[PDB]
Design a protein around this ligand. Structure first.
Ligand SMILES: Cc1cc2nc3c(=O)[nH]c(=O)nc-3n(C[C@H](O)[C@H](O)[C@H](O)COP(=O)(O)O)c2cc1C
Ligand SMILES: Cc1cc2nc3c(=O)[nH]c(=O)nc-3n(C[C@H](O)[C@H](O)[C@H](O)COP(=O)(O)O)c2cc1C
Lengths: 217, 217
């Protein structure tokens, strides 16, 4: 509405209404938000698993079977459950896939502009995978940027969601065969409509005062 | 005009118009955006620096040195410049500051409900802090989540912005004494209004197809 109005009214939902499914239109919009999120050098080091079926959702809920049981209902009652994944290593095949896609979309006027752009991405990529040896952590951050974009995007659509770190990535990666494919699960985000059992919806929002976290100059 | 339109039309502005400044209401709005962002266990492991004066922006612009001289113009021409910083380590006092804030906000019905939220947080904290030994990374991921929330947010307000990783953190940290305060600059986001020289405002948007990044189940 006010994007500040949605920012202030949104909340991580604790209980979902199993009966409230997303319309095919919202299911499409939600996917658009996942795809069009920005990332450093437009590297898009990610993969998304959108579960809509009960068998699919239950497959995801398998990762919270351990000591994260209090999270299962959340992944089952929600309409769609999206698991954000990040690349395990930045490879040359992925970088070529990006600039070639940028070229296909008409972003370069000459072949030199494309070369310069590829060289520029390589500068950052090599800085992480060659020098600092932190390319995996680098890419993981880009996915979290996407989740942040996503959580605000859904709230603005009028949908309820909750980010979940409380799940076993080892089991999740195993169940979907990810990272044989070069990926690792990071965040599981259930999307749908909240029920009445969600007490968090009627509680006041809480954040530290700006005089603690903000410095103006 | 819904958010999908907002996400499709926004772009990483390459050139800023120094004459077009943020309105006073817009200044308080981007601050509200920064603070009201979600984060794992509401840990809010962050600090921000909002530079709006010539003196402040030049101080940040110092980080745009050596190999990053190409980003100096963006930091000086943008109306406001936000430096997203993350805590260098999770200390018990900060965990206490968070719990007591939620309490003063009325999020707890009983004192036993407040303690349960504390141990719930400490659980995740000690997980990264003690076990995994990756709390610095964990907290930075929450800061990248704020950037994703912030980027979509300012775009929704009608502003132009650009995430910048290309800058020397060691210079920026030292210029603001962040180091001794337990923080580290990670992302710089100049916000304002793009100028006619911003070629990125007219080029087509490019993202990989969903048949590569998305898997439905
Ligand atoms: C990355 C991330 C992970 C989270 N994981 C969980 C979780 O496992 N379970 C849960 O109930 N809430 C989880 N949350 C919700 C946060 O605690 C919530 O953002 C915080 O309490 C602030 O409340 P709000 O989101 O309503 O503004 C998570 C949030 C984030 C950003
Ligand atoms: C974390 C991050 C860092 C970025 N760093 C820079 C930068 O240093 N300079 C720049 O001009 N663009 C930078 N970008 C912009 C990206 O190249 C841009 O997000 C990508 O090309 C997609 O274009 P769009 O944001 O216009 O959709 C960055 C983006 C992100 C998310």
């Amino acid at each position: 509405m006010d994007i500040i109005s949605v920012a202030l009214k949104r909340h991580s939902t604790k209980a979902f209404d199993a009966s409230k499914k997303l319309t095919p239109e919202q299911a499409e919009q939600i996917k658009t938000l996942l795809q069009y999120s920005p990332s450093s050098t437009n590297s898009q080091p990610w993969h998304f698993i959108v579960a809509s079926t009960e068998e699919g959702k239950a497959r995801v809920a398998k990762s919270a079977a351990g000591n994260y049981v209090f999270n299962e209902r959340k992944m089952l009652d929600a309409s769609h459950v999206v698991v954000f994944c990040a690349k395990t290593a930045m490879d040359d095949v992925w970088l070529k896939l990006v600039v070639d896609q940028e070229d296909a979309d008409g972003r370069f006027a000459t072949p030199e502009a494309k070369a310069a752009n590829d060289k520029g991405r390589k500068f950052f990529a090599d800085m992480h995978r060659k020098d600092l040896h932190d390319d995996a952590e680098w890419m993981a951050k880009q996915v979290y940027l996407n989740v942040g974009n996503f959580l605000l995007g859904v709230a603005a659509l009028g949908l309820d969601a909750v980010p979940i770190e409380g799940f076993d990535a080892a089991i999740l990666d195993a169940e979907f065969g990810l990272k044989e494919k070069g990926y690792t699960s990071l965040v599981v985000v259930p999307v749908g409509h909240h029920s009445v059992e969600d007490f968090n919806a009627t509680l006041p929002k809480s954040r530290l005062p700006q005089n603690i976290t903000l410095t103006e100059v």
